[PDB]
Amino acid sequence: MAMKAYSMLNVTATLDGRRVIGLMDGDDAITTSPGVDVGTMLVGADGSWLFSQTADKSATVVIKLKPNSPTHRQLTEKWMAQRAGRLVGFPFDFIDSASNEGGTGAEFFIQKAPDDSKGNNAVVREWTIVTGEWTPTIPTLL
């Protein structure tokens, strides 16, 4: 079970059951960030201290797409479904087969919609989705 070097050919992302396909160029095409800081240190006037840990386990992910990708059509249909008043979960999941690093979330929602720029060359379309519960997977292959 040799440790495969990194490659985007071996990363898979699944949005509502379908694959994510037409991604923009760059080192940051799918990025997930936790919602808050894990904890806070409180130091008093005497030198004693107290740590406090949060119970909030939430995250956002940002997906950068090309103007010609089926995932853009899927996300723009989901946006219109939300605008109509139909509010459901739509899971998102992605993982790397080389290291088993990734995470899952069983209920996501659209948070930001992209800007439609036409101009002279084609440009990015950035979507943002948010969940209330994100559990990272343990990389068991280091």
Add this chain to the structure above:
Amino acid sequence: MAMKAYSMLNVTATLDGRRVIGLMDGDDAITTSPGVDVGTMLVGADGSWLFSQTADKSATVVIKLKPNSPTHRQLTEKWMAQRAGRLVGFPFDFIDSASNEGGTGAEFFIQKAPDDSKGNNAVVREWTIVTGEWTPTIPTLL
């Protein structure tokens, strides 16, 4: 006892008993910073002055890792243990053998978690840990 020139081959960092191994590239791979200013000068309307010194001895350290490093797996297990509700110390320590400069802290906690970016090339994973008591070691070899 010749003063060794600097080298990352002679710096050792120990997190919860294990070594820190897969570090990113750059001049800032492990950095520790004190929590507050050491003191404050107060000058009055007449020209007299008063200094005040704090009793807070706390610090954070930031560790930058590659996406393929066992320390990333160790830290992501510690993060999940904290999220479950188990809150303990886990010492961190690092030193330079050329000058005996460094410091120790007997109880640390996870404060910030990294962002999982996939993209076209591999990128940094930055962790942050915090303690309420950090004691620097005296560089006795200058």
Add this chain to the structure above:
Amino acid sequence: MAMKAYSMLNVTATLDGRRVIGLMDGDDAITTSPGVDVGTMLVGADGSWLFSQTADKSATVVIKLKPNSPTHRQLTEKWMAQRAGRLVGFPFDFIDSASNEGGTGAEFFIQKAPDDSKGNNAVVREWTIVTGEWTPTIPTLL
């Protein structure tokens, strides 16, 4: 005998014989205030005047603590002893070694009890104690 700059490392407070340890953050962690004004000027319809000085020498002190401090346990035991019907003095004393400024009172009583707030981060616990006789000490080191 150099005049030491201010530092909370050199202030000592003694409550019923034991030290006060886990204090909150801020510039006002132990504050003592006199009960009344020292005197009153009375000016008549003709321009003559008369001063009057009070015989009341009483004060309160407010102590702000963290939710994890042994002094909080000591004060909550004293509160229950008072609620049972046992009413005695319990001296309080604090001083600064840099200037010899402070004061003493041989018989204090609990006056206000804190609020127990849980929430997401830890917060202050404020106690108030009152005496009928408070004598400030003279700062002989200026």
Add this chain to the structure above:
Amino acid sequence: MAMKAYSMLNVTATLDGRRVIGLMDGDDAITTSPGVDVGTMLVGADGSWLFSQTADKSATVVIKLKPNSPTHRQLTEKWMAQRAGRLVGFPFDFIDSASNEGGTGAEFFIQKAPDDSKGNNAVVREWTIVTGEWTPTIPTLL
């Protein structure tokens, strides 16, 4: 028996036998305050003094909830039961496992009811309950 840092994952609140679940964001989600001052100092025209201690041991607690929480449904059923004319106790209890700080009251009553605001984002629902007898528990873990 290590002193656990603070965390809302280790605070438990029980209202009429059931847990309290959907709480709003902030550092003040459950707060209990005593009904009156513990005592009063009376100083005479000559400088003599007299302390007086009260026999009233009562408190209120304020609970801040989200508009989607089962505790909101439980409290709105209790409110209607009181409005019908059925007046009974319903105990409330909450404690912190890290320090054993908290308190209990065997008979509470609804005192204030929240405001139903709809608006553009979701907002707080604040309930208030009152007891005639509140006994704090001693924090034996400091």
Add this chain to the structure above:
Amino acid sequence: MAMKAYSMLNVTATLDGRRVIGLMDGDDAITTSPGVDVGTMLVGADGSWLFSQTADKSATVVIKLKPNSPTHRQLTEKWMAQRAGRLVGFPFDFIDSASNEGGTGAEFFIQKAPDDSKGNNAVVREWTIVTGEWTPTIPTLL
């Protein structure tokens, strides 16, 4: 029957049979508040206590509207009908379909009338209505 996230697209308010349409911006566009406190605790000089519950079940609601909304015209006609001397009930009702939270009142009355400000940008028009009997509905979907 999935628990729908909150949305103003799924809140419906009915005033005298017609819908409420042009609402101002903010998190507080329709707010209902009870008229009085639910009860009162009375503690005696000895430590004994007595609770008392009120029989008053009344509320006000405040509606914030834009200067161009048909509900403003409806309310200003109702105000003139009251000023003429015709005094009848006009029910008001509103509910949230996601949680079944809301309430009804079969007889309301105008209590406060808005201020007509012209100025440079358009501003709020706030109406207030009052009932003698308000019954909240139980949120059966939590």
Add this chain to the structure above:
Amino acid sequence: KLPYSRVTNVTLTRTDNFPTRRGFGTQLILTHTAVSGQVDATKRTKLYASLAEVEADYPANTSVYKAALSAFSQNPRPIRLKVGYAATPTGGDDAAKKADFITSLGAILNYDQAFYQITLDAALRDQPYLDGLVEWVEAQPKIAMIDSNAAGHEDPANTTVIAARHKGTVERTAVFYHTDSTEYLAASMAAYMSTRVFDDANSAYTLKFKKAPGVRAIDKGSAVVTAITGFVEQTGQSESAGHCANTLIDIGDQEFLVEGSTLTQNVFLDEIHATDWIIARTEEEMLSLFLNNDRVPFTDQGMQQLASVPRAIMQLAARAGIVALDLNPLTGAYEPAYTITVPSVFDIPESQRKARIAPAIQVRFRYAGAVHYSVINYTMTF
């Protein structure tokens, strides 16, 4: 119908229960009695859980029950006393010979190493063969304590008693001198000493010098309390003018232990207890380091990984109040409280490298004491 005991179980007894409050250590009770059901050559030592569950040793025998009675009788309680089988033969087949007692001592380690404080009780008192224990607990990571029921330590001249024939030469033994019929070592040691947790801030009980046991009785006298405990008023403690021991005097309406359990002229019990906590904690952290890692290599990186353990233990100890506060006690000038120096494997030959025994790491100290005696002057001017 049915009882409520179908779904719950609520009982009620008439006894006294105190909170547990785990602490540091355990004590040993060695005698000659055997119970035949739990020590009968199968257990040179036997552990327990609580006093009430004692059945093997009779609730009237002077040795075990009357000593565990004062062992378990502190307001917070210790747990799991280490019960006895050790020197079941009477001192020695030739009684005056201490060789049999020394061999008996050397054959009770081979079953169990979990005791730290060694107490003989209700018997073996004032035996000449007991000299083996005093000679043997030296260079042995334990604490030896002997409570007499009666002797002539009240003469500041005699040299035949326990505390005279061994005074100023032993630094790990102490005497609990008293009158007849009271077990005393168990009263405070392992009952107050045991439930001392040094993992908290400011948990340094440096004295052990004014501490109240559960229930007991005082001795009598004023000029006899200085022949015993060898304590002079304001000078300190003098070796020639008394014999060190502990007697539980009463001054006001309070009764409390006195002299703070000295061992020799100016060596106190808390120093030994705290330093032994330091050693036992470094042992535990070293073992926990060998179980987490795959390996610890025989390089300089491995030496630094090993030396990371005393660095954390010293920061833990300076917080409790055992290690001093970074200032010269003579002049108040700055001075480091502790240093840690790591050796080099480099010039240690490969001839010795194959040993798989690492070179020694050296650490430095400074103790922080406490106050036993106060002075106030009170000039009056009228």
Add this chain to the structure above:
Amino acid sequence: AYMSTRVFDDANSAYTLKFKKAPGVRAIDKGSAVVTAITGFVEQTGQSESAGHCANTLIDIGDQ
């Protein structure tokens, strides 16, 4: 069972000791001066051939 699943194709995968390793489920033996007749291990000197016989016994020291 532990020896088998050792992959030396990774960095720093040298378990040079095999000296403090926990099996799945088992029981300890007993003694202190009997654990040096077996395993022939003296305290700080090393391991001596004349003063014992080498073997493996799965001791317990702390709670491990």
Add this chain to the structure above:
Amino acid sequence: RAGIVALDLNPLTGAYEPAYTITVPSVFDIPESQRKARIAPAIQVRFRYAGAVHYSVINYTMTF
């Protein structure tokens, strides 16, 4: 890389020393009398082992 072979330094003095060498023989002066064997001559390789730690020592002098 795994950590089995040592790190290129003399264990006695810490001076530089190669960890491993590989010497390849010559078929040239091996006779054709032996060449027809289809058995190649032997290649010789050199080692140095990297051990680990079984036992630790700490001294702890106290000064008061």
Add this chain to the structure above:
Amino acid sequence: KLPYSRVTNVTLTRTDNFPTRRGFGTQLILTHTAVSGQVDATKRTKLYASLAEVEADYPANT
């Protein structure tokens, strides 16, 4: 059970220890005293390592 001295060795003495700090030179102490076990015509000079390990010369000789 077993002691922790089975896998480690942690001690404690009551003495003063300073860092080594190697330097340049050595001095010579010439007198007429002989110790008969370490200088007895076999060593016109003899080296040491530390003071504490001195046994051949009496800890009281001037």
